[PDB]
Design a protein around this ligand. Sequence first.
Ligand SMILES: C[C@]12CC[C@@H]3c4ccc(O)cc4CC[C@H]3[C@@H]1CC[C@@H]2O
Ligand SMILES: C[C@]12CC[C@@H]3c4ccc(O)cc4CC[C@H]3[C@@H]1CC[C@@H]2O
Lengths: 235, 235
Amino acid sequence: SLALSLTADQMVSALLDAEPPILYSEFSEASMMGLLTNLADRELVHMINWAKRVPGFVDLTLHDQVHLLECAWLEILMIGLVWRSMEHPGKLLFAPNLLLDRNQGKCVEGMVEIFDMLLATSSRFRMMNLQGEEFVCLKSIILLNSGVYTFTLKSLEEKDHIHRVLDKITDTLIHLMAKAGLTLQQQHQRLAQLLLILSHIRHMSNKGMEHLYSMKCKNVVPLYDLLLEMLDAHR
Amino acid sequence: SLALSLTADQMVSALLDAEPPILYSEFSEASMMGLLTNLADRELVHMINWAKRVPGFVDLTLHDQVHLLECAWLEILMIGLVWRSMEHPGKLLFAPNLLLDRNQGKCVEGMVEIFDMLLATSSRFRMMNLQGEEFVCLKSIILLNSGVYTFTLKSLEEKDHIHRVLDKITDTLIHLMAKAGLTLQQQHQRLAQLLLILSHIRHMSNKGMEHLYSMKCKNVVPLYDLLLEMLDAHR
Ligand SMILES: C[C@]12CC[C@@H]3c4ccc(O)cc4CC[C@H]3[C@@H]1CC[C@@H]2O
Ligand SMILES: C[C@]12CC[C@@H]3c4ccc(O)cc4CC[C@H]3[C@@H]1CC[C@@H]2O
């Protein structure tokens, strides 16, 4: 596997390279859910493409790739938002031309809490001064670790492969940190601080599907096909 | 804060010491949900006690302690189960005298998937040969990190405190690993492997409340007060 041969430096660039393009967005509960939902549906296409370039991904069986995708779509979309929203304290930059503010969350039922969790993460990223090389690694960790406990003998081999690439990505992270000259102890603390945010992202994502789902049941969400597909995987 | 002064060794023992007693359990969807639910309600009591002894906990305001508790109760209960279920492949040891098997999950509606996730975690713990000192540390990390992004100036101080203790627990983990003689590189890989399971635990707990909540709506779950209290915090 290429994954298992690249050096921390190649890995980082490979990842830096797979990054997708930033889309542009095309207010009432319905009008807002529409934009947000539309933007999501569009990034989903890019997402799939990006997934194909994360070192090691393509080595899984075609159904396993769909599984990780279906499992982490919203997590991936949320860390992206968080990351691009970093330098806009108190706001969320869905797009370069769509910058909602906390209070605009009140437009849709039950959205403010999600916005709140999103802002808090965004803020934590600001405080830790998260680097783009770090960002790109976490995003791949999310893609690979989220659906791993839900994949038999081919699964055991699929699980190892994933664990193995996850170790490589870990090494890349530490590599990056040492290069920024953090003590060996600061390196292990940052690592742990970064990976503990992933829990919150899981948390948020779970609340996000639950919400997107009621929005769909209330018939407020449009019929975007790829987005309903990813949402159904979960239900 | 004591927390910030203990040495990795004292930290470990302090944690090893706070461990609660193992309860004993006192089949139809209703009869099963009853046992499971009853057992949970009982461990909740011990849980609160235990939380009071996790170094640094007691330094938070009284309401923040209730908040972390309300936030991580089911995550805590689930890692405990998983941990005690380790050496019983394919089974879940709720109690010393209550050992359900995967298929017994089918008794209650929607429970098998939860059991499945539980088994998978239990299995991963087996594979990594998770030590008790490690177990005790992760459990505290869960208690402290889960409700941290949902706590102002006192909050900023509360958040730092928590981040601080989190680093100390991180150091304790590494300390443990080095003592078992793992290379510096195996140390950082194991760390990341241990913390990534926390995501899955978050995920499982989220599904678990969703389920316990429908079980309650279907009027199958008894009226245990402490358990309804923790469940309501989430809703
Ligand atoms: C899924 C939601 C609509 C799509 C939103 C979105 C849309 C695009 C995007 O890049 C990130 C997110 C984060 C929050 C998501 C929202 C969570 C609640 C809502 O249902
Ligand atoms: C909360 C549930 C009943 C209580 C169960 C329990 C009860 C006691 C315990 O120590 C661990 C768990 C793990 C799974 C929990 C279940 C998840 C689904 C169910 O509703």
